[PDB]
Amino acid sequence: TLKYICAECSSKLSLSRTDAVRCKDCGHRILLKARTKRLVQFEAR
Amino acid sequence: MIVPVRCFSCGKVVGDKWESYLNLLQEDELDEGTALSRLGLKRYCCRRMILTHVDLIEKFLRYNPLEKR
Amino acid sequence: TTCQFLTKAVLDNEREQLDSPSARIVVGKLNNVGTGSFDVLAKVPNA
Amino acid sequence: RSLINPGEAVGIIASQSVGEPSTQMTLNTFNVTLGIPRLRE
Amino acid sequence: SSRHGQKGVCSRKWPTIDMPFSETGIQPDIIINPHAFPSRMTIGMFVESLAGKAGALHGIAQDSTPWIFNEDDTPADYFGEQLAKAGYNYHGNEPMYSGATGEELRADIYVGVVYYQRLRHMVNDKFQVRSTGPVNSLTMQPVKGRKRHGGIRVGEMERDALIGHGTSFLLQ
Amino acid sequence: ETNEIGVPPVFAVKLTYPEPVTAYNIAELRQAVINGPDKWPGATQIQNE
Amino acid sequence: MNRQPTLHKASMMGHKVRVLPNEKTLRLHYANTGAYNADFDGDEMNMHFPQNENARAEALNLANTDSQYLTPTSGSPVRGLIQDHISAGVWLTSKDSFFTREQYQQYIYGCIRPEDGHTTRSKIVTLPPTIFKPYPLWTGKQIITTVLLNVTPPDMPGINLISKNKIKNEYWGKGSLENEVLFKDGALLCGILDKSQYGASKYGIVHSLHEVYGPEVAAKVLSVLGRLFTNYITATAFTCGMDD
Amino acid sequence: GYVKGRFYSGIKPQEYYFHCMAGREGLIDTAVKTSRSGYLQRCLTKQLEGVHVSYDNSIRDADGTLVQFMYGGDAIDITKESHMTQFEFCLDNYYALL
Amino acid sequence: TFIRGPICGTDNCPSRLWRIIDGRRTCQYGHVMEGDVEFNDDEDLG
Amino acid sequence: EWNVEKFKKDFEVNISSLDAREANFDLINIDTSIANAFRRIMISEVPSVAAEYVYFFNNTSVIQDEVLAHRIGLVPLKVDPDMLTWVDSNLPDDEKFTDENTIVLSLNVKCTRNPDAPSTDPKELYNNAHVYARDLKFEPQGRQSTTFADCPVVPADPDILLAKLRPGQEISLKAHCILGIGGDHAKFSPVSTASYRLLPQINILQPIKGESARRFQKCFPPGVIGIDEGSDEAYVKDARKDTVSREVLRYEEFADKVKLGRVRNHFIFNVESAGAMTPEEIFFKSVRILKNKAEYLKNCPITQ
Amino acid sequence: EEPDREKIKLLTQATSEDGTSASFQIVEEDHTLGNALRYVIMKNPDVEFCGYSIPHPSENLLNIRIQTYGETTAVDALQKGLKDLMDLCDVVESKFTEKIKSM
Amino acid sequence: TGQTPIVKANLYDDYGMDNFPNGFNAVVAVISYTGYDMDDAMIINKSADERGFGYGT
Amino acid sequence: RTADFRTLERESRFINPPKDKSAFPLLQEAVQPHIGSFNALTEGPDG
Amino acid sequence: RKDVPKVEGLKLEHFATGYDAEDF
Ligand SMILES: [Zn+2]
Q1: Which residues are registered as beta bridge partners of A31?
Q2: Where does the chain bind Mg(2+) (chain G)?
Q3: G73-76 long-range contacts, CB within 8 A, separation 24+
Q4: Where in chain J do CATH 2.170.120.12 domains reside?
């Protein structure tokens, strides 16, 4: 599941369409994207 | 940030000695010179890695965007 | 004063002889100082 | 065998032999005009 | 840079394999040339070098506020006296061996612990190479640009430098 | 050397020189075409007649 | 190559290409830093690559760095070794400098390779030691003699030069003559070597070899000495401390 | 402002303040040194651009007009005259110079 | 990652080509096109 | 004149102390070029196992991903080399990491809040707040579940603090550990310091008995100079204990009556360990690398 | 099988007609073997000149040069040196084996 | 990874400059050894760098 | 001189920020020319 | 003028390789 995080109260969240960029719980207009399980590789250097 | 795993000059593993060092200063009330020598650091390059570490990770961790407040 | 001297040369019907190094770089001719102050000619053997 | 060669750009070299060490010549008093303001006259 | 105006570009990252090593076994992290000292006269770096090594040994920190010391209370005598009680050289020198040949260096090397700093501006967006490429539509000359893959300017002064050599074909 | 310059391999596989192919440099210029644009003593274009 | 404020024509010279692996910057010798007004602290230099044999022949014969040894302003030399190489010649050409056979032969091949075409003989020739019996030892002035013997052409006589140093005779003790520099038939017999000899300084040994042997030889002696004092600094370092 | 202190032993606060005065007097002179000699050399090189040595040793301009009859009075390259009057050097190295 | 424009020749195919140095254009098999002019300009709101 | 029998008669080894981590020993009558080669190979050419590639699946901690991968590479694993073979870095990733080249470590930590009663310490306040190197789990891939079952892969220092967490944050990674040498990267260097020093020689010239020996005692480490009487007056007890501080040279009483030299063929090696191998074993492994470094040139055709 | 002909390479431009004077170039080497091998070759009473040299630090190439007096080529004196350095590491290994078992 | 200085002023603590570490303590040798460090140039240790010396983002 | 680094005092203040007025009061007196100047626009005598 | 305070309690903390505090 694609998700976001409320930037004021850290409540997880997802928005699809005809959906305002707001926190459902508080009304914060700033949302930050969460990171999900996805592979990245690094050399240990 | 966190304690360096190895020392820059010698290459001793030093990262296992930061919590031991803070207990020799707190509990045993040693000075910094005796506390470093009981941890087995005796080259002054390996001494300054534990002696002079700032540990800013404790100040970064207060800004957690994944938990409330 | 580029167009100032340009007017002085058009009224004068001047033939730029292309021998100063600023006049040769404009027209792309080889410079006349150093390795361009002489010609090279190949001596061919048959009549 | 120490002569100047024909085709040598002595006019550029003379101007570069004044214009380059004039960059060294740009400081204050250690009366008469000195340095670059004298040389520009 | 250190805290004394002794800045310096990293010229080469030199392997520990062939960097000089001490009696203690230490290879230094930074090598600074002693020819950077006589014209700069930053003597605060020489006294920081023996103050910092005295503090790494004894586990103490040193005050380096100006005008704590005196001409009768010279800090080379103060922090030198602390190196002698640890068992090091009074003058801050260390017997040190060659990494490359393995022989002992001729004089004991002045080694210590100096606080260093990394400057922010770096040399990434500085190099460019063009064999051919984009032009301009008016002049058909190579375009300007670092990231537009653009040419290098042979200016007015370089035209005069190519006449001064008498090289008419390099100008061509 | 004091008369030399040390060129990085980034520059070295980018700048090219139009060498005309002849009977004395065909040994060098074959290996330059074989090495191609990535191995360093190589080439990047050939120009036909 | 040109450093970009191009004041005089020696700031745009012709270099030979040496392609170095594992490196990301242009890389230049110290003997070229006087002509470009260059310090290695974030300066850039442009690299122009000419595209026909007329322009290769000019950048190798007219604009090369070997013909720019003397500047046209007053005829003074502008090329020479700079900081550690000056302070290694005061140690190597000193009178305490003694070298054994394995040390002597290693310093000669560290600076002179016959495979890179430094020798004029294809075989490195050496000298007898100056101390035979108690232990066979060479002298540090006798290393300067050997590297002039191998890079100067064989069918000419050696150099003859009576010059001075910058270093007064009183600094060496009683009755020393280490201020007079004496070359006799290409053998350094007296005096240490300074900035006054292989720096960018007139009437030294490097400026004398330029007059007698030509610009190609005096450019090779600046390379051979620069590798000699680099390898001597690595085997025997130089430091400045607090006790100084 | 006569500093009897030395950098080995450190300087006093009064004579620390006067030494900062002498450190800024050189830096302010560079601050008045924006563009000095860049246009002096451009004016010389534009006139003296085409002046060259001709094959009859005269110094002429590119259009042909004569400027001098011989370079410096003696027709000597400056970069070749250094051991010209070093006669004792040239006498010691006679066989190599020959 | 190919971008359109005019047609192509080099005895193969009317299509979009492969520019090599962002103003010099090649074909898909290693034959060269002529003079892309690559309109750029500098900025000296002013 | 020099020989190999003439070298075997004069060469000596005196082993001072040997331990599971450090080892002091002497090499008597050997050249500096040979002993520098032994010091060289121990730092640079003796191979070891360390994490090389790190595959983050999630990392929501404060520490950057590339920083946390760097810290895992510096952790000394107690894997014995010669259990692994060398990887081949040209053939691609679907064919490159086999079970005979590679050791897989994993890390899967989540931080939650602990319900506690009391400005309090975060071991009593969060769950899995600190991540250590002992949280790296050995996953025995392939047929080497049975040859690493005798002694599994563990970090040689299990209390290396890798990361710190707060609740909500997690780290999920998986590191492939490969074999390599310390000239490539310093994480493969199996030694904390392989170094030597040359034996100090303290030549007393004039007899300095009496109270001029009591103050000659103190210009050296305590076990170095001894006193008996005016007879057996001031002598070197142990010239191995001395750090070359030259403290006796800044007193004018002794500036003529002593020298400080070295014994040039007598080396004092101090070899430590990062943990994977005992330090007496990476001295053997060094003297055999130099031997094989010459065999491979002897048994090699001289080209052109 | 097929050996590795890219490791050691005689530079034929500096090799004499007799073979008594030669130069070599070894890939992936530095001061480690070149200083240890120069020491063992210089214990030959027939070697007149020997020294190693690293042309540039940024490439891993090792030039060593041998000049003999005659009566032995420089390839014969290189492989006497590699053989006497194999033998010299067997002595150090044996003394260090015997003295760990002597504790 | 910043470090506090061993050699610091007393006012380093009063302004709370330990919350903002600006550099790192380095074992510095004043030596001319390599030939690559002249006029403005220094030499970094390679194995120190591989162990994280002077790293930043 | 003796001038210690306050290593236990630093780590206590990192983990546990103060719940009173701030430590390091010289740091707030460095910007008192800016903050106090803006504060005089609304607070103080004559409104 | 008060002198710069000599730190009291300074001991031997550089021992040669392989040695420790064996000095009593
Ligand atoms: Zn085509």
Answers
A1: A6
A2: 39, 41, 43
A3: G73/D16, G73/D17, G73/D20, G73/D21, G73/G8, G73/H78, G74/H78, G75/H78, G75/H79, G75/H81, G75/H82, G76/G200, G76/G202
A4: 48-186
Smallest CA-to-CA distance from E26 within J218, L31, J25 is with: L31
Nearest chain G Cα distance for residue D1, angstroms = 12
Contacts of M16 in chain J (CB under 8 A): 119
Domain of residue K45: give its range.
1-103
Which residues, 6+ apart, have CB-to-CB distance to D29 below 8 Å? none
Query: How many domains would you assign to chain B?
Result: 1
**Inter-chain residue contact K63 with G114, CB threshold 8 Å:** no
Close Cβ partners of E78 (under 8 Å, ≥ 6 residues apart):
E69, N4, N6
The rounded distance, in Å, linking the Cα atoms of E15 and D38 is: 55
Pairing verdict, β A12-13 and E109-116: unpaired
Q: Which chains pack against E, by 3+ Cβ pairs within 8 A? A: B, C, D, F, G, H, I, J, K, L, M, N
Amino acid symbol at E41: M
8 Å CB contact between G198 and G204: yes
Give the whole-angstrom CA distance, residue C11 versus residue G119: 67
Position J248: which residue type?
A: V
Beta strands L41-45; E9-14: pairing state: parallel
Q: Is G109 on the interface with K (CB under 8 A)?
A: yes
Helix (H) or strand (E) holding G230: helix G215-235
Among J302, J182, J206, J297, CA closest to J259: J206
Residues near ion ligand 1 (CB < 5 Å) are I 10, 27, 29, 31
Q: How far is CA A18 from CA A7, A15, A21, A22, in A?
A: 21, 9, 10, 12
Contacts of E147 (CB under 8 A, 6+ apart): none
Experimental technique used to determine this entry: cryo-EM
- φ/ψ (deg, to 5) at B33: -75, -40
Alpha helices in chain K (DSSP H): 31-41, 74-100
> D12 vs G7: CB contact, 8 Å cut-off?
no
Domains of chain G, earliest start first: 1-68 (2.40.40.20), 69-239 (1.10.274.100)
Contact indicator for E70, E41 with CB cutoff of 8 Å: no
Find tokens 């150099």 and name the residue.
Answer: G159
Answer yes or no: do J122 and M16 touch at CB < 8 A. Answer: no
| Distance in angstroms (rounded) separating the CA atoms of residues M23 and G99 | 65
Task: Decide if G234 and L30 are in contact by the 8 Å CB cutoff.
Answer: no
Asked if residues E9 and E127 have their Cβ atoms less than 8 Å apart, the reply is no
Q: Where are the domain boundaries for CATH 3.30.1360.10 in chain J?
A: 1-47+187-304
Identify the contact set of chain D against chain E, taking CB-CB distances under 8 A: 7-9, 12-13, 15-16
Class of domain J1-47+187-304: alpha beta
Query: Which residues neighbour J187 within 8 Å (Cβ) at sequence distance 6 or greater?
Result: A44, A45, J50, J51, J73, J74, L50, L51
Counting every residue written for chain B, the total comes to 69
Which of G12, K59, E131, G51 is closest to F11 using CA atoms? E131
What are the backbone dihedrals phi and psi of residue J241, each rounded to the nearest 5 degrees, phi first? Answer: -75, -20
- Angle at CA N14, nearest 5°, toward N13 and N20? 85
Assigned fold of J48-186: RNA Polymerase Alpha Subunit; Chain A, domain 2 (2.170.120)
First to last CA, chain G: 41
Angle at E106 between CA E103 and CA E107, to 5 degrees: 130
Q: Output the furthest CA–CA distance in chain E (Å, rounded).
A: 78
The terminus-to-terminus CA distance of chain I in angstroms comes to: 36
Count of CB atoms within 10 A of residue G230's CB?
A: 21
Alpha-carbon gap: L50 to the closest alpha carbon of chain E (Å)? 10
